[PDB]
């Protein structure tokens, strides 16, 4: 019982069907046409061995070679050793609750600024922050768990453990960072480079307290920061210690490379270009008070050359390492602080609404993705853009008395006091402190841009 050739649709072609369908438009639409390319064969390499120290507590510098020809993905190595704290001390350690605890998302938050340099000036920035915004936005809504499982994913960096059993993985975290290369532009290196451009890439680490929290336990044998300490598992299967301090082994940086040929590098020499692309900048992120009530109070300011689009955001770090918060929750994911916030202005104000309407009802209507349930405030005022293609746009040079607004919550005010909804407490994780907790504040914010780069030598 079914349709051999049912057929009666054909028959149908009266005005509707016959704007859009027959006519001088795909003489065929199951064929493809194709477009031949380009001869290149790309497989990656490691870079150079790099300046200076590298690991927790520096800012190494790598370089790049030309034998290559393009560049087009980017990202940073590492490893991690086991880590966990010890009794024995002196006399032991606490008896019974110790703990240990690392961050929510750890490649993200350790790598400081980072940035290229063309031997007299900057071209391109970044920050923690950054990664932390683009986690959600620009990545697809498949694609989270495969980043996550290549950083800051599993009940072993978070779900602490008290101390004699140990925590940590020993393996590898990947980190990609893009570079002045999402959209497969690529680098005029053998022909423009050459000279005297002498590319070198920065990076800026930090000290693994920064990273890590501990709430000492009672017991009047309290722990610790050095006492932590590496961890290895033996030959036959037991807990072994030393005195060596965490750190990371291998910091290397593995960029792919694209060849082609001779004739394809030499269109180029002959012709300089020019190109257009994006980089961000920022605000020296400033202290706030978000303690009083529903009255606007608080104020700021924001500067930046022309644009496309700009992220802001919150935090109440208010301890020694549960980073990447943004709420008023001390320990663990929460509410938002602030609501209703806006855009001071002039005239023709860009915003007059809103705080939910930033985060959920503009990215529905124009960025890729969605965010979780904890508060990256976001909006733009032209398209994504994301792809380098040029859709909307404006300049910060001009309403020289740029500013913007903010206001706050209650559930601010009440954490900012040490409460929440229902005359709560707040304990504190650096330490046992049920209530008495002052929750300190942040303001911060990012921009991308768009610029236009030159380059017959250099750039």
Same mark, same amino acid.
């Given at each position: ?39 290149? &064969? ?54 019974? #609750? ?92 053998? !022909?423009?480079?050459? +000279? ?29 920061? $050095? ?18 301090? +965490? ?26 270009? $020019? ?7 920022? !605000? ?9 009530? #529903? ?67 503009? +990215? ?19 398209? $994504?853009?994301?792809? &380098? $293609? ?61 610029? !236009? ?7």
């Amino acid at each position: 019982v079914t349709a051999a050739s049912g057929f009666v649709d054909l028959a149908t072609f009266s005005d509707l069907e016959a704007y859009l369908y027959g006519g001088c438009s795909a003489v065929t639409y199951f064929v493809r046409a194709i477009k031949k390319a380009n001869w290149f &064969s790309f497989l990656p390499v490691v870079l150079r061995n790099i300046s200076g120290l590298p690991g927790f507590g520096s800012e190494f510098s790598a370089s790049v070679n030309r034998s290559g020809d393009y560049v087009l993905n980017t990202w940073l190595r590492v490893r991690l050793p086991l880590v966990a704290i010890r009794p024995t001390n002196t006399g032991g350690a606490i008896n019974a #609750n110790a703990t240990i605890r690392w961050t929510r998302n750890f490649m993200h938050n350790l790598v400081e600024k980072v940035n290229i340099t063309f031997n007299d000036l900057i071209v391109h920035e970044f920050d923690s922050y950054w990664f932390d915004f683009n986690s959600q936005f620009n990545i697809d809504a498949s694609k989270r768990v495969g980043y996550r499982n290549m950083i800051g994913d599993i009940p072993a960096m978070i779900n602490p453990v008290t101390t004699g059993n140990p925590l940590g993985t020993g393996e590898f975290f990947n980190l990609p960072i893009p570079l002045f290369y999402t959209e497969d532009s690529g680098l005029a290196l053998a !022909v423009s480079a050459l +000279p005297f451009n002498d590319i070198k890439i920065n990076y800026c680490l930090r000290r693994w307290q920064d990273l890590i929290v501990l709430n000492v336990g009672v017991g009047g044998n309290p722990p610790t920061y $050095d006492d932590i300490v590496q961890v290895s598992y033996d030959s036959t299967f037991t807990l072994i210690y030393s005195s060596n301090a +965490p750190a990371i082994t291998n910091v290397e940086t593995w960029c792919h490379y694209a060849v082609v040929h001779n004739d394809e590098r030499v269109k180029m020499g002959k012709n300089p270009r $020019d190109m257009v692309i994006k980089q961000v900048q920022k !605000v020296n992120e400033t202290t706030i008070n978000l303690s009083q009530l #529903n009255a606007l109070v608080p104020i700021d300011i924001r500067v930046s050359h022309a644009v496309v689009g700009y992220f802001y955001a919150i935090r109440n770090s208010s301890t020694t390492g549960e980073w990447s918060n943004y709420t008023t929750e001390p320990a663990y994911a929460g509410l938002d602080p602030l609501e209703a916030a806006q855009l001071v202005y002039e005239s023709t104000a860009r915003v007059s609404n809103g705080s939910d309407y930033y985060s959920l009802m503009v +990215p529905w209507y124009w960025h890729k993705s969605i965010p979780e349930e904890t508060g990256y405030h976001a909006y733009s005022y032209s398209l $994504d853009t994301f792809a &380098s $293609d040029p859709k909307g746009s404006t300049n910060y040079s001009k309403l020289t008395n740029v500013s913007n607004q903010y206001v706050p919550s209650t559930a601010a005010v009440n954490a900012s006091a040490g409460v929440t909804n229902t005359g709560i407490p707040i304990p504190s994780a650096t330490n046992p402190a049920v209530t008495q907790q002052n929750q300190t504040f942040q303001h911060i914010f990012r921009v991308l841009n768009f610029n !236009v780069l030159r380059l017959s030598g250099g750039s």
